[PDB]
Amino acid sequence: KALGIS
Amino acid sequence: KALGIS
Amino acid sequence: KALGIS
Amino acid sequence: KALGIS
Amino acid sequence: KALGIS
Amino acid sequence: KALGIS
Amino acid sequence: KALGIS
Amino acid sequence: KALGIS
Amino acid sequence: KALGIS
Amino acid sequence: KALGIS
Amino acid sequence: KALGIS
Amino acid sequence: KALGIS
Amino acid sequence: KALGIS
Amino acid sequence: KALGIS
Amino acid sequence: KALGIS
Amino acid sequence: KALGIS
Amino acid sequence: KALGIS
Amino acid sequence: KALGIS
Amino acid sequence: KALGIS
Amino acid sequence: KALGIS
């Protein structure tokens, strides 16, 4: 799974 | 912040 | 399952 | 915040 | 089951 | 908030 | 089942 | 908000 | 926010 | 399932 | 922010 | 799955 | 910032 | 800062 | 997976 | 997995 | 700064 | 500073 | 994987 | 893995 935070 | 986990 | 938070 | 889990 | 909160 | 669970 | 919230 | 689940 | 889960 | 939040 | 997970 | 945040 | 993960 | 992990 | 941050 | 921080 | 990882 | 690890 | 930072 | 810091 990938993770992104603005 | 926005946050997403695929 | 994927997770999103605005 | 809005939140979704698929 | 999926979950959504506005 | 509105909330739904499929 | 799909879920939508305006 | 309006809400629908198919 | 609007939210959809397919 | 896909997830979208405006 | 808008957020999508395919 | 792909992830996008505006 | 915008963020994407393919 | 924005942060992503693929 | 590829990662991009504006 | 790759890591990026703006 | 913008950042990309292929 | 921005930081990336491939 | 390649890395670029503006 | 490669490392870059602006």
XYZ file of all heavy atoms in Angstrom:
800
model
N 0.820 -1.206 0.000
C 0.000 0.000 0.000
C 0.863 1.267 0.000
O 1.918 1.320 0.645
C -0.950 0.009 1.205
C -2.018 -1.098 1.239
C -2.716 -1.076 2.603
C -4.045 -1.814 2.601
N -5.076 -1.091 1.798
N 0.404 2.277 -0.735
C 1.086 3.562 -0.823
C 0.481 4.554 0.171
O -0.671 4.394 0.605
C 0.979 4.108 -2.240
N 1.260 5.572 0.528
C 0.851 6.576 1.501
C 1.105 7.974 0.965
O 2.209 8.275 0.492
C 1.650 6.411 2.806
C 1.527 7.613 3.748
C 0.094 7.709 4.252
C 2.504 7.543 4.913
N 0.110 8.847 1.076
C 0.323 10.236 0.729
C -0.290 11.188 1.733
O -1.402 10.971 2.227
N 0.442 12.253 2.017
C 0.003 13.311 2.919
C 0.301 14.629 2.223
O 1.431 14.883 1.803
C 0.764 13.260 4.270
C 0.489 11.943 4.999
C 0.361 14.430 5.175
C 1.419 11.714 6.187
N -0.721 15.467 2.093
C -0.576 16.755 1.426
C 0.281 17.709 2.246
O 0.581 17.451 3.420
C -1.948 17.384 1.224
O -2.534 17.695 2.480
N -4.223 18.900 6.575
C -3.662 18.029 5.548
C -4.632 16.929 5.128
O -5.432 16.426 5.923
C -2.341 17.408 6.024
C -1.197 18.408 6.146
C -0.421 18.161 7.422
C 0.404 19.376 7.820
N 1.102 19.173 9.135
N -4.555 16.561 3.859
C -5.296 15.422 3.374
C -4.357 14.229 3.461
O -3.130 14.388 3.411
C -5.743 15.652 1.946
N -4.928 13.039 3.601
C -4.131 11.828 3.726
C -4.816 10.664 3.034
O -6.023 10.446 3.207
C -3.870 11.501 5.208
C -3.060 10.246 5.556
C -2.329 10.468 6.874
C -3.924 8.985 5.638
N -4.043 9.891 2.276
C -4.578 8.720 1.626
C -3.632 7.549 1.779
O -2.404 7.724 1.795
N -4.208 6.361 1.923
C -3.455 5.121 1.892
C -4.151 4.186 0.902
O -5.353 3.896 1.040
C -3.395 4.464 3.289
C -2.720 5.413 4.286
C -2.684 3.108 3.207
C -2.654 4.880 5.708
N -3.408 3.709 -0.096
C -4.019 2.973 -1.199
C -4.442 1.584 -0.763
O -4.083 1.112 0.327
C -3.068 2.880 -2.401
O -1.974 2.022 -2.116
N -8.352 -2.801 1.786
C -9.172 -1.596 1.786
C -8.310 -0.328 1.786
O -7.254 -0.276 2.432
C -10.122 -1.587 2.991
C -11.190 -2.694 3.025
C -11.888 -2.672 4.389
C -13.218 -3.410 4.388
N -14.249 -2.687 3.584
N -8.768 0.681 1.051
C -8.086 1.966 0.963
C -8.691 2.958 1.958
O -9.843 2.798 2.391
C -8.193 2.512 -0.453
N -7.912 3.976 2.314
C -8.321 4.980 3.287
C -8.067 6.378 2.752
O -6.964 6.679 2.278
C -7.522 4.815 4.592
C -7.646 6.017 5.534
C -9.079 6.113 6.039
C -6.668 5.947 6.699
N -9.062 7.251 2.862
C -8.849 8.640 2.515
C -9.462 9.592 3.519
O -10.575 9.375 4.014
N -8.730 10.658 3.803
C -9.170 11.715 4.706
C -8.872 13.033 4.009
O -7.742 13.287 3.589
C -8.408 11.664 6.056
C -8.684 10.347 6.785
C -8.811 12.834 6.961
C -7.753 10.118 7.973
N -9.893 13.871 3.879
C -9.748 15.159 3.212
C -8.892 16.113 4.033
O -8.591 15.856 5.206
C -11.120 15.788 3.010
O -11.707 16.099 4.267
N -13.395 17.304 8.362
C -12.834 16.433 7.334
C -13.804 15.333 6.914
O -14.604 14.830 7.710
C -11.513 15.813 7.810
C -10.370 16.812 7.932
C -9.593 16.565 9.208
C -8.768 17.780 9.606
N -8.070 17.577 10.921
N -13.727 14.965 5.645
C -14.468 13.826 5.160
C -13.530 12.633 5.248
O -12.303 12.792 5.197
C -14.915 14.056 3.733
N -14.101 11.443 5.387
C -13.303 10.232 5.512
C -13.989 9.068 4.820
O -15.195 8.850 4.993
C -13.042 9.905 6.994
C -12.232 8.650 7.342
C -11.501 8.872 8.660
C -13.096 7.389 7.424
N -13.216 8.295 4.062
C -13.751 7.124 3.412
C -12.804 5.954 3.565
O -11.576 6.128 3.581
N -13.380 4.766 3.709
C -12.627 3.526 3.679
C -13.323 2.590 2.689
O -14.525 2.300 2.826
C -12.568 2.868 5.076
C -11.892 3.817 6.072
C -11.857 1.512 4.993
C -11.827 3.284 7.495
N -12.581 2.113 1.690
C -13.191 1.377 0.587
C -13.615 -0.011 1.023
O -13.256 -0.484 2.113
C -12.241 1.284 -0.614
O -11.146 0.426 -0.330
N -17.524 -4.397 3.573
C -18.345 -3.192 3.573
C -17.482 -1.924 3.573
O -16.426 -1.871 4.218
C -19.295 -3.183 4.777
C -20.363 -4.289 4.812
C -21.060 -4.268 6.175
C -22.390 -5.006 6.174
N -23.421 -4.283 5.371
N -17.941 -0.915 2.837
C -17.258 0.370 2.750
C -17.863 1.362 3.744
O -19.015 1.202 4.177
C -17.365 0.916 1.333
N -17.085 2.380 4.101
C -17.493 3.384 5.074
C -17.240 4.782 4.538
O -16.136 5.083 4.065
C -16.694 3.219 6.378
C -16.818 4.421 7.320
C -18.251 4.517 7.825
C -15.841 4.351 8.485
N -18.234 5.655 4.649
C -18.022 7.045 4.302
C -18.635 7.996 5.306
O -19.747 7.779 5.800
N -17.903 9.062 5.590
C -18.342 10.119 6.492
C -18.044 11.437 5.796
O -16.914 11.691 5.375
C -17.580 10.069 7.843
C -17.856 8.752 8.572
C -17.983 11.238 8.747
C -16.925 8.522 9.760
N -19.066 12.275 5.666
C -18.920 13.564 4.999
C -18.064 14.517 5.819
O -17.764 14.260 6.993
C -20.293 14.192 4.797
O -20.879 14.504 6.053
N -22.568 15.708 10.148
C -22.006 14.838 9.121
C -22.976 13.737 8.701
O -23.777 13.234 9.496
C -20.685 14.217 9.596
C -19.542 15.216 9.719
C -18.766 14.969 10.995
C -17.941 16.184 11.392
N -17.242 15.981 12.707
N -22.900 13.369 7.431
C -23.640 12.230 6.947
C -22.702 11.037 7.034
O -21.475 11.196 6.984
C -24.087 12.460 5.519
N -23.273 9.847 7.173
C -22.475 8.636 7.299
C -23.161 7.472 6.606
O -24.367 7.254 6.779
C -22.214 8.309 8.781
C -21.405 7.055 9.129
C -20.674 7.276 10.447
C -22.269 5.793 9.211
N -22.388 6.699 5.848
C -22.923 5.529 5.198
C -21.977 4.358 5.351
O -20.749 4.532 5.367
N -22.553 3.170 5.495
C -21.799 1.930 5.465
C -22.495 0.995 4.475
O -23.698 0.704 4.613
C -21.740 1.273 6.862
C -21.065 2.221 7.859
C -21.029 -0.084 6.779
C -20.999 1.688 9.281
N -21.753 0.517 3.477
C -22.363 -0.219 2.374
C -22.787 -1.607 2.810
O -22.428 -2.080 3.899
C -21.413 -0.312 1.172
O -20.319 -1.170 1.457
N -21.895 -3.140 -3.082
C -22.715 -1.934 -3.082
C -21.853 -0.667 -3.082
O -20.797 -0.614 -2.436
C -23.665 -1.925 -1.877
C -24.733 -3.032 -1.843
C -25.431 -3.010 -0.479
C -26.761 -3.748 -0.480
N -27.792 -3.026 -1.284
N -22.311 0.343 -3.817
C -21.629 1.627 -3.905
C -22.234 2.620 -2.910
O -23.386 2.459 -2.477
C -21.736 2.174 -5.321
N -21.455 3.637 -2.553
C -21.864 4.642 -1.581
C -21.610 6.040 -2.116
O -20.507 6.341 -2.590
C -21.065 4.477 -0.276
C -21.189 5.679 0.666
C -22.622 5.774 1.171
C -20.211 5.608 1.831
N -22.605 6.913 -2.006
C -22.392 8.302 -2.353
C -23.005 9.254 -1.349
O -24.118 9.036 -0.854
N -22.273 10.319 -1.065
C -22.713 11.376 -0.162
C -22.415 12.695 -0.859
O -21.285 12.948 -1.279
C -21.951 11.326 1.189
C -22.227 10.009 1.918
C -22.354 12.496 2.093
C -21.296 9.780 3.105
N -23.436 13.532 -0.989
C -23.291 14.821 -1.656
C -22.435 15.774 -0.835
O -22.134 15.517 0.338
C -24.663 15.450 -1.858
O -25.250 15.761 -0.601
N -26.938 16.965 3.494
C -26.377 16.095 2.467
C -27.347 14.994 2.046
O -28.147 14.491 2.842
C -25.056 15.474 2.942
C -23.913 16.474 3.064
C -23.136 16.226 4.340
C -22.311 17.442 4.738
N -21.613 17.239 6.053
N -27.270 14.627 0.777
C -28.011 13.488 0.292
C -27.073 12.295 0.380
O -25.846 12.453 0.329
C -28.458 13.718 -1.135
N -27.644 11.104 0.519
C -26.846 9.894 0.644
C -27.532 8.730 -0.048
O -28.738 8.511 0.125
C -26.585 9.567 2.126
C -25.775 8.312 2.474
C -25.044 8.534 3.792
C -26.639 7.051 2.556
N -26.759 7.957 -0.806
C -27.294 6.786 -1.456
C -26.347 5.615 -1.303
O -25.119 5.789 -1.287
N -26.923 4.427 -1.159
C -26.170 3.187 -1.189
C -26.866 2.252 -2.179
O -28.068 1.961 -2.042
C -26.111 2.530 0.208
C -25.435 3.479 1.204
C -25.400 1.174 0.125
C -25.370 2.946 2.627
N -26.124 1.775 -3.177
C -26.734 1.039 -4.281
C -27.158 -0.350 -3.845
O -26.799 -0.822 -2.755
C -25.784 0.946 -5.482
O -24.689 0.088 -5.198
N -17.766 18.561 1.707
C -17.205 17.691 0.680
C -18.175 16.590 0.260
O -18.975 16.087 1.055
C -15.884 17.070 1.156
C -14.740 18.070 1.278
C -13.964 17.822 2.554
C -13.139 19.038 2.952
N -12.441 18.835 4.267
N -18.098 16.222 -1.009
C -18.839 15.083 -1.494
C -17.900 13.890 -1.406
O -16.673 14.049 -1.457
C -19.286 15.314 -2.921
N -18.471 12.700 -1.267
C -17.674 11.490 -1.142
C -18.360 10.326 -1.834
O -19.566 10.107 -1.661
C -17.413 11.162 0.340
C -16.603 9.908 0.688
C -15.872 10.129 2.006
C -17.467 8.646 0.770
N -17.587 9.553 -2.592
C -18.121 8.382 -3.242
C -17.175 7.211 -3.089
O -15.947 7.385 -3.073
N -17.751 6.023 -2.945
C -16.998 4.783 -2.975
C -17.694 3.848 -3.966
O -18.896 3.557 -3.828
C -16.939 4.126 -1.579
C -16.263 5.074 -0.582
C -16.227 2.770 -1.661
C -16.197 4.542 0.840
N -16.951 3.370 -4.964
C -17.562 2.635 -6.067
C -17.985 1.246 -5.631
O -17.626 0.774 -4.541
C -16.611 2.541 -7.269
O -15.517 1.684 -6.984
N -12.723 -1.544 -4.868
C -13.543 -0.338 -4.868
C -12.681 0.929 -4.868
O -11.625 0.982 -4.223
C -14.493 -0.329 -3.663
C -15.561 -1.436 -3.629
C -16.259 -1.414 -2.265
C -17.588 -2.152 -2.267
N -18.619 -1.430 -3.070
N -13.139 1.938 -5.603
C -12.457 3.223 -5.691
C -13.062 4.216 -4.697
O -14.214 4.055 -4.263
C -12.564 3.769 -7.108
N -12.283 5.233 -4.340
C -12.692 6.238 -3.367
C -12.438 7.636 -3.903
O -11.334 7.937 -4.376
C -11.893 6.073 -2.062
C -12.017 7.275 -1.120
C -13.449 7.370 -0.615
C -11.039 7.204 0.045
N -13.433 8.509 -3.792
C -13.220 9.898 -4.139
C -13.833 10.849 -3.135
O -14.945 10.632 -2.641
N -13.101 11.915 -2.851
C -13.541 12.972 -1.948
C -13.242 14.291 -2.645
O -12.113 14.544 -3.065
C -12.779 12.922 -0.598
C -13.054 11.605 0.131
C -13.182 14.091 0.307
C -12.124 11.376 1.319
N -14.264 15.128 -2.775
C -14.119 16.417 -3.442
C -13.262 17.370 -2.622
O -12.962 17.113 -1.448
C -15.491 17.046 -3.644
O -16.077 17.357 -2.387
N -8.594 20.157 -0.079
C -8.032 19.287 -1.106
C -9.002 18.186 -1.526
O -9.803 17.683 -0.731
C -6.711 18.666 -0.631
C -5.568 19.666 -0.508
C -4.792 19.418 0.768
C -3.967 20.633 1.165
N -3.268 20.430 2.480
N -8.926 17.818 -2.796
C -9.666 16.679 -3.280
C -8.728 15.486 -3.193
O -7.501 15.645 -3.243
C -10.113 16.910 -4.708
N -9.299 14.296 -3.054
C -8.501 13.085 -2.928
C -9.187 11.921 -3.621
O -10.393 11.703 -3.448
C -8.240 12.758 -1.446
C -7.431 11.504 -1.098
C -6.700 11.725 0.220
C -8.295 10.242 -1.016
N -8.414 11.148 -4.379
C -8.949 9.978 -5.029
C -8.003 8.807 -4.876
O -6.775 8.981 -4.860
N -8.579 7.619 -4.732
C -7.825 6.379 -4.762
C -8.521 5.444 -5.752
O -9.724 5.153 -5.614
C -7.766 5.722 -3.365
C -7.091 6.670 -2.368
C -7.055 4.366 -3.448
C -7.025 6.137 -0.946
N -7.779 4.966 -6.750
C -8.389 4.230 -7.853
C -8.813 2.842 -7.417
O -8.454 2.369 -6.328
C -7.439 4.137 -9.055
O -6.345 3.280 -8.770
N -3.550 0.052 -6.654
C -4.371 1.257 -6.654
C -3.508 2.525 -6.654
O -2.452 2.578 -6.009
C -5.321 1.266 -5.450
C -6.388 0.160 -5.415
C -7.086 0.182 -4.052
C -8.416 -0.556 -4.053
N -9.447 0.166 -4.856
N -3.966 3.534 -7.390
C -3.284 4.819 -7.477
C -3.889 5.812 -6.483
O -5.041 5.651 -6.050
C -3.391 5.365 -8.894
N -3.111 6.829 -6.126
C -3.519 7.834 -5.153
C -3.266 9.232 -5.689
O -2.162 9.533 -6.162
C -2.720 7.669 -3.849
C -2.844 8.870 -2.907
C -4.277 8.966 -2.402
C -1.867 8.800 -1.742
N -4.260 10.105 -5.578
C -4.048 11.494 -5.925
C -4.660 12.445 -4.921
O -5.773 12.228 -4.427
N -3.929 13.511 -4.637
C -4.368 14.568 -3.735
C -4.070 15.886 -4.431
O -2.940 16.140 -4.852
C -3.606 14.518 -2.384
C -3.882 13.201 -1.655
C -4.009 15.687 -1.480
C -2.951 12.972 -0.467
N -5.092 16.724 -4.561
C -4.946 18.013 -5.228
C -4.090 18.966 -4.408
O -3.790 18.709 -3.234
C -6.319 18.641 -5.430
O -6.905 18.953 -4.174
N 0.579 21.753 -1.865
C 1.140 20.883 -2.893
C 0.170 19.782 -3.313
O -0.630 19.279 -2.517
C 2.461 20.262 -2.417
C 3.605 21.261 -2.295
C 4.381 21.014 -1.019
C 5.206 22.229 -0.621
N 5.904 22.026 0.694
N 0.247 19.414 -4.582
C -0.494 18.275 -5.067
C 0.444 17.082 -4.979
O 1.672 17.241 -5.030
C -0.941 18.506 -6.494
N -0.127 15.892 -4.840
C 0.671 14.681 -4.715
C -0.015 13.517 -5.407
O -1.221 13.299 -5.234
C 0.932 14.354 -3.233
C 1.742 13.100 -2.885
C 2.473 13.321 -1.567
C 0.878 11.838 -2.803
N 0.758 12.744 -6.165
C 0.224 11.574 -6.815
C 1.170 10.403 -6.662
O 2.398 10.577 -6.646
N 0.594 9.215 -6.518
C 1.347 7.975 -6.548
C 0.651 7.040 -7.538
O -0.551 6.749 -7.401
C 1.406 7.318 -5.151
C 2.082 8.266 -4.155
C 2.118 5.961 -5.234
C 2.148 7.733 -2.733
N 1.393 6.562 -8.537
C 0.783 5.826 -9.640
C 0.360 4.438 -9.204
O 0.718 3.965 -8.114
C 1.734 5.733 -10.841
O 2.828 4.875 -10.557
N 4.949 20.495 4.789
C 5.511 19.625 3.762
C 4.541 18.524 3.342
O 3.740 18.021 4.137
C 6.832 19.004 4.237
C 7.975 20.004 4.360
C 8.751 19.756 5.636
C 9.577 20.972 6.033
N 10.275 20.769 7.348
N 4.618 18.157 2.072
C 3.877 17.018 1.588
C 4.815 15.825 1.675
O 6.042 15.983 1.625
C 3.430 17.248 0.160
N 4.244 14.635 1.814
C 5.042 13.424 1.940
C 4.356 12.260 1.247
O 3.150 12.042 1.420
C 5.303 13.097 3.422
C 6.112 11.842 3.769
C 6.843 12.064 5.088
C 5.248 10.581 3.852
N 5.129 11.487 0.489
C 4.594 10.316 -0.161
C 5.540 9.145 -0.008
O 6.769 9.320 0.008
N 4.965 7.957 0.136
C 5.718 6.717 0.106
C 5.022 5.782 -0.884
O 3.819 5.492 -0.747
C 5.777 6.060 1.503
C 6.453 7.009 2.499
C 6.488 4.704 1.420
C 6.518 6.476 3.922
N 5.764 5.305 -1.882
C 5.154 4.569 -2.985
C 4.730 3.180 -2.549
O 5.089 2.708 -1.460
C 6.104 4.476 -4.187
O 7.198 3.618 -3.902
N 5.622 1.648 -8.441
C 4.802 2.853 -8.441
C 5.664 4.121 -8.441
O 6.720 4.174 -7.795
C 3.852 2.862 -7.236
C 2.784 1.756 -7.202
C 2.086 1.777 -5.838
C 0.756 1.039 -5.839
N -0.275 1.762 -6.643
N 5.206 5.130 -9.176
C 5.888 6.415 -9.264
C 5.283 7.408 -8.269
O 4.131 7.247 -7.836
C 5.781 6.961 -10.680
N 6.062 8.425 -7.913
C 5.653 9.429 -6.940
C 5.907 10.827 -7.475
O 7.011 11.128 -7.949
C 6.452 9.265 -5.635
C 6.328 10.466 -4.693
C 4.896 10.562 -4.188
C 7.306 10.396 -3.528
N 4.912 11.700 -7.365
C 5.125 13.090 -7.712
C 4.512 14.041 -6.708
O 3.400 13.824 -6.213
N 5.244 15.107 -6.424
C 4.804 16.164 -5.521
C 5.102 17.482 -6.218
O 6.232 17.736 -6.638
C 5.566 16.114 -4.171
C 5.291 14.797 -3.442
C 5.163 17.283 -3.266
C 6.221 14.567 -2.254
N 4.081 18.320 -6.348
C 4.226 19.609 -7.015
C 5.083 20.562 -6.194
O 5.383 20.305 -5.021
C 2.854 20.237 -7.217
O 2.268 20.549 -5.960
N 9.993 0.390 -1.786
C 9.172 1.596 -1.786
C 10.035 2.863 -1.786
O 11.091 2.916 -1.141
C 8.222 1.605 -0.582
C 7.155 0.498 -0.547
C 6.457 0.520 0.816
C 5.127 -0.218 0.815
N 4.096 0.504 0.012
N 9.577 3.873 -2.522
C 10.259 5.157 -2.609
C 9.654 6.150 -1.615
O 8.502 5.989 -1.182
C 10.152 5.704 -4.026
N 10.432 7.167 -1.258
C 10.024 8.172 -0.285
C 10.277 9.570 -0.821
O 11.381 9.871 -1.294
C 10.823 8.007 1.019
C 10.699 9.209 1.961
C 9.266 9.304 2.466
C 11.676 9.139 3.126
N 9.283 10.443 -0.710
C 9.495 11.832 -1.057
C 8.883 12.784 -0.054
O 7.770 12.566 0.441
N 9.614 13.849 0.230
C 9.175 14.907 1.133
C 9.473 16.225 0.437
O 10.603 16.478 0.016
C 9.937 14.856 2.484
C 9.661 13.539 3.213
C 9.534 16.026 3.388
C 10.592 13.310 4.401
N 8.452 17.062 0.307
C 8.597 18.351 -0.361
C 9.453 19.304 0.460
O 9.754 19.047 1.634
C 7.225 18.980 -0.563
O 6.638 19.291 0.694
N 9.751 23.349 -3.652
C 10.312 22.479 -4.679
C 9.343 21.378 -5.099
O 8.542 20.875 -4.304
C 11.634 21.858 -4.203
C 12.777 22.857 -4.081
C 13.553 22.610 -2.805
C 14.378 23.825 -2.407
N 15.076 23.622 -1.092
N 9.419 21.010 -6.368
C 8.679 19.871 -6.853
C 9.617 18.678 -6.766
O 10.844 18.837 -6.816
C 8.232 20.101 -8.281
N 9.046 17.488 -6.626
C 9.843 16.277 -6.501
C 9.158 15.113 -7.193
O 7.952 14.895 -7.020
C 10.104 15.950 -5.019
C 10.914 14.696 -4.671
C 11.645 14.917 -3.353
C 10.050 13.434 -4.589
N 9.931 14.340 -7.951
C 9.396 13.169 -8.601
C 10.342 11.999 -8.448
O 11.570 12.173 -8.432
N 9.766 10.811 -8.304
C 10.519 9.571 -8.335
C 9.823 8.635 -9.325
O 8.621 8.345 -9.187
C 10.579 8.913 -6.938
C 11.254 9.862 -5.941
C 11.290 7.557 -7.020
C 11.320 9.329 -4.519
N 10.566 8.158 -10.323
C 9.955 7.422 -11.426
C 9.532 6.034 -10.990
O 9.891 5.561 -9.900
C 10.906 7.329 -12.628
O 12.000 6.471 -12.343
N 14.122 22.091 3.003
C 14.683 21.221 1.975
C 13.713 20.120 1.555
O 12.913 19.617 2.351
C 16.004 20.600 2.451
C 17.148 21.600 2.573
C 17.924 21.352 3.849
C 18.749 22.568 4.247
N 19.447 22.365 5.562
N 13.790 19.752 0.286
C 13.049 18.613 -0.199
C 13.987 17.421 -0.111
O 15.215 17.579 -0.162
C 12.602 18.844 -1.626
N 13.416 16.230 0.028
C 14.214 15.020 0.153
C 13.528 13.856 -0.539
O 12.322 13.637 -0.366
C 14.475 14.693 1.635
C 15.285 13.438 1.983
C 16.016 13.659 3.301
C 14.421 12.177 2.065
N 14.301 13.083 -1.297
C 13.767 11.912 -1.947
C 14.713 10.741 -1.794
O 15.941 10.915 -1.778
N 14.137 9.553 -1.650
C 14.890 8.313 -1.680
C 14.194 7.378 -2.670
O 12.992 7.087 -2.533
C 14.949 7.656 -0.283
C 15.625 8.605 0.713
C 15.661 6.300 -0.366
C 15.691 8.072 2.135
N 14.936 6.900 -3.669
C 14.326 6.165 -4.772
C 13.903 4.776 -4.336
O 14.261 4.304 -3.246
C 15.277 6.072 -5.973
O 16.371 5.214 -5.689
N 14.795 3.244 -10.227
C 13.974 4.449 -10.227
C 14.837 5.717 -10.227
O 15.892 5.770 -9.582
C 13.024 4.458 -9.022
C 11.956 3.351 -8.988
C 11.258 3.373 -7.624
C 9.929 2.635 -7.626
N 8.898 3.358 -8.429
N 14.378 6.726 -10.962
C 15.060 8.011 -11.050
C 14.455 9.003 -10.056
O 13.303 8.843 -9.622
C 14.953 8.557 -12.467
N 15.234 10.021 -9.699
C 14.826 11.025 -8.726
C 15.079 12.423 -9.262
O 16.183 12.724 -9.735
C 15.624 10.860 -7.421
C 15.501 12.062 -6.479
C 14.068 12.158 -5.975
C 16.478 11.992 -5.314
N 14.085 13.296 -9.151
C 14.297 14.685 -9.498
C 13.684 15.637 -8.494
O 12.572 15.420 -8.000
N 14.416 16.703 -8.210
C 13.977 17.760 -7.308
C 14.275 19.078 -8.004
O 15.405 19.332 -8.424
C 14.738 17.709 -5.957
C 14.463 16.392 -5.228
C 14.336 18.879 -5.052
C 15.393 16.163 -4.040
N 13.253 19.916 -8.134
C 13.398 21.204 -8.801
C 14.255 22.158 -7.981
O 14.555 21.901 -6.807
C 12.026 21.833 -9.003
O 11.440 22.144 -7.746
N 19.165 1.986 -3.573
C 18.345 3.192 -3.573
C 19.207 4.459 -3.573
O 20.263 4.512 -2.927
C 17.395 3.201 -2.368
C 16.327 2.094 -2.334
C 15.629 2.116 -0.970
C 14.299 1.378 -0.971
N 13.268 2.100 -1.775
N 18.749 5.469 -4.308
C 19.431 6.753 -4.396
C 18.826 7.746 -3.401
O 17.674 7.585 -2.968
C 19.324 7.299 -5.813
N 19.605 8.763 -3.045
C 19.196 9.768 -2.072
C 19.450 11.166 -2.608
O 20.554 11.467 -3.081
C 19.995 9.603 -0.767
C 19.871 10.805 0.175
C 18.439 10.900 0.680
C 20.849 10.734 1.340
N 18.455 12.039 -2.497
C 18.668 13.428 -2.844
C 18.055 14.379 -1.840
O 16.943 14.162 -1.345
N 18.787 15.445 -1.556
C 18.347 16.502 -0.653
C 18.645 17.821 -1.350
O 19.775 18.074 -1.770
C 19.109 16.452 0.697
C 18.834 15.135 1.426
C 18.706 17.621 1.602
C 19.764 14.906 2.614
N 17.624 18.658 -1.480
C 17.769 19.947 -2.147
C 18.626 20.900 -1.326
O 18.926 20.643 -0.153
C 16.397 20.576 -2.349
O 15.811 20.887 -1.092
